[PDB]
């Protein structure tokens, strides 16, 4: 039932500044009022993050995703390498009630969209291996971090109430771990899912690099401040 559209969804690929966003808890250890230095994959401070106002983008080591969501327009994500039945493909969709995660050799069309009048963006669903159902993920800022290391898919998330107009605010907010998948795939590209009825989508995408950070833990074990060591000499 999937057909190509007429107009090209050429969202303007602008650039903007990351500031101090994209910090997540690296493990499940409790620390109280202490400074801890750790080396891992992070988003560099004051980086160049791409802004879209639905192309295929590379995955690289990890992905930082941000949405200035108004009334839940974004719905899901697709992951894979060949994006067909030749190789395993991953699908995540947050519908009105639950979240569904599937790992199958789907047969996607050339333009995915959820549609409203559940899943009909794939002609076939063969050799399904992993299935998962859980509670929903989602004028709000929705921040997500996706990583894939040694057969494990890590998803971190955070929600923020913001009143600023366009760009990312100046502040600090650590990202808590959300979901782990014990599945081994070699994803290299990914795609975004919109439930656009047949009748304008702003989000931000950034990449990750390995580096060292310094984190401060308060009395209650919450990360309140961080320092990027690979920056101006004062930070070092």
């Amino acid at each position: 039932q999937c057909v190509n559209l007429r107009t090209r969804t050429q969202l303007p690929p602008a650039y903007t500044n990351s500031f101090t966003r994209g910090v997540y808890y690296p493990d499940k250890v409790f620390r109280s009022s202490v400074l801890h230095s750790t080396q891992d994959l992070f988003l560099p401070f004051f980086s160049n993050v791409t802004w879209f106002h639905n192309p295929v983008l590379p995955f690289n080591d990890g992905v930082y995703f941000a949405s200035t969501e108004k009334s839940n327009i974004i719905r899901g994500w697709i992951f894979g390498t060949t994006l067909d039945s030749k190789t395993q493909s991953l699908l995540i969709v947050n519908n009105a009630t639950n979240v569904v995660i599937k790992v199958c050799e789907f047969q996607f069309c050339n333009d995915p969209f959820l549609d409203v009048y559940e899943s009909g963006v794939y002609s076939s669903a063969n050799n399904c291996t992993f299935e998962y159902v859980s509670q929903p993920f989602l004028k709000n800022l929705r921040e997500f971090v996706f990583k894939n290391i040694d057969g494990y898919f890590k998803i971190y998330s955070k929600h923020t109430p913001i009143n600023l107009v366009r760009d990312l605010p100046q502040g600090f907010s650590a990202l808590e771990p959300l979901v782990d998948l014990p599945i081994g795939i070699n994803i290299t590209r990914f795609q975004t899912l919109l439930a656009l009825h047949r009748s304008a989508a702003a989000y931000y995408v950034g990449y990750l690099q390995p580096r060292t950070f310094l984190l401060k833990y308060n009395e209650n074990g919450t990360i309140t401040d961080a320092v990027d060591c690979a920056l101006d000499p004062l930070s070092e």
Partner: protein
């Protein structure tokens, strides 16, 4: 003291002989409540089983399987495990399981085995020599066999070649033994490869229908997800014991803590990477760990030349868990530890044999 000093005489002084530590009492292991059992019920209690050449294949992953109940069942005639012992299967585990279920003859139960040949072994299902797993076979004469003949069950009999391991053939092509061509009609040199089973209630043991399920385990590089439940036990407090909290092992005394973990951590460390707090996977409460006491022991003597009685000092040890020198004489508790053998007086003299914290001992008794 003499043995450590390697002499038969000792002069007046204080010497450090050995150490002392509290031994652990018992062990405790904790684990989550255990859920998501593997669905073995619908396989071994299935109403119907497919044919031998159309064996049902089932994938098992992401669940916990209890093989103890399967092993303890006495209703199964044959339970043969080759790769591993069934008793130890509950400990080790692999990444996925393949189940092949079908029905065969009673006399053909040993066809499906490594290094075995036969009609089924060469035309319906083949098992490799290096196969690892288990086979469970049990009689189904009372259910599968029919008074009118259970002709629904069939088996492959004719094929030019044999079957590869883990290979299924369901082809209905008219087998041509000879060189005479047949246009889909069986003739002198053409026969139907499939033959129907004729089970009857009064047939005899060996020809009766037998339900057979073969379980194979595979260990692809993806993490293992299916194997036995992790047994747990109760917990104790205020006693130096060794613990295995969700795979984190260590010894010490467990107490109730007032720390407030944030809802996703599992344990905490203060500094220098030493764990101090844990969370039990069942009650979901924060416990505090303290290393149970230890310290050195020292002896105070007035010299072998003078007398032969001594005093014993345990360094940095509370005078509550000392243990022939368990009770002995009057026992003194000092800021330097605990002391047994000497007597506390109210006077004050010059210091002969230093002890610590502003106090010392001498020989009068000591």
């Amino acid at each position: 003291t003499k043995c450590t000093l390697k002499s038969f005489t000792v002069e007046k002084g204080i010497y450090q002989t050995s150490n002392f530590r509290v031994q652990p009492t018992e062990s405790i292991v904790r684990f989550p409540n255990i859920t998501n059992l593997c669905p073995f019920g619908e396989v071994f209690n299935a109403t119907r089983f497919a044919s031998v050449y159309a064996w049902n294949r089932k994938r098992i992953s992401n669940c916990v399987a209890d093989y103890s109940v399967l092993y303890n069942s006495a209703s199964f005639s044959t339970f043969k495990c080759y790769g591993v012992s069934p008793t130890k299967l509950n400990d080790l585990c692999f990444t996925n399981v393949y189940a092949d279920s079908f029905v065969i003859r009673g006399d053909e139960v040993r066809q499906i085995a490594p290094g075995q040949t036969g009609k089924i072994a060469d035309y319906n299902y083949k098992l490799p020599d290096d196969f690892t797993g288990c086979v469970i076979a049990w009689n189904s004469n009372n259910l599968d066999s029919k008074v009118g003949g259970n002709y629904n069950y069939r088996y492959r009999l004719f094929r030019k070649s044999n079957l590869k391991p883990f290979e299924r053939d369901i082809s209905t092509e008219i087998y041509q033994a000879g060189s005479k061509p047949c246009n889909g009609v069986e003739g002198f040199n053409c026969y139907f490869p499939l033959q129907s089973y004729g089970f009857q209630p009064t047939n005899g043991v060996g020809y009766q229908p037998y339900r057979v399920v073969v379980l194979s385990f595979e260990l692809l590089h993806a993490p293992a997800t299916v194997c036995g439940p992790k047994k747990s036990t109760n917990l104790v407090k205020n006693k130096c014991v060794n613990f295995n909290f969700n795979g984190l092992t260590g010894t010490g005394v467990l107490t109730e803590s007032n720390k407030k973990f944030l809802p996703f951590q599992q344990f905490g460390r203060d500094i220098a990477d030493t764990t101090d707090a844990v969370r039990d996977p069942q009650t979901l409460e924060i416990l505090d760990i303290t290393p149970c006491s230890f310290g050195g022991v020292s002896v105070i003597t007035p010299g072998t030349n003078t007398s032969n009685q001594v005093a014993v000092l345990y360094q940095g040890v509370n005078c509550t868990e000392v243990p022939v020198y368990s009770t002995g004489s009057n026992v003194f508790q000092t800021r330097a530890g605990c002391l047994i053998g000497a007597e506390h007086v109210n006077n004050s003299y010059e210091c002969d044999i230093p002890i610590g914290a502003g106090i010392c001992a001498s020989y009068q008794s000591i």
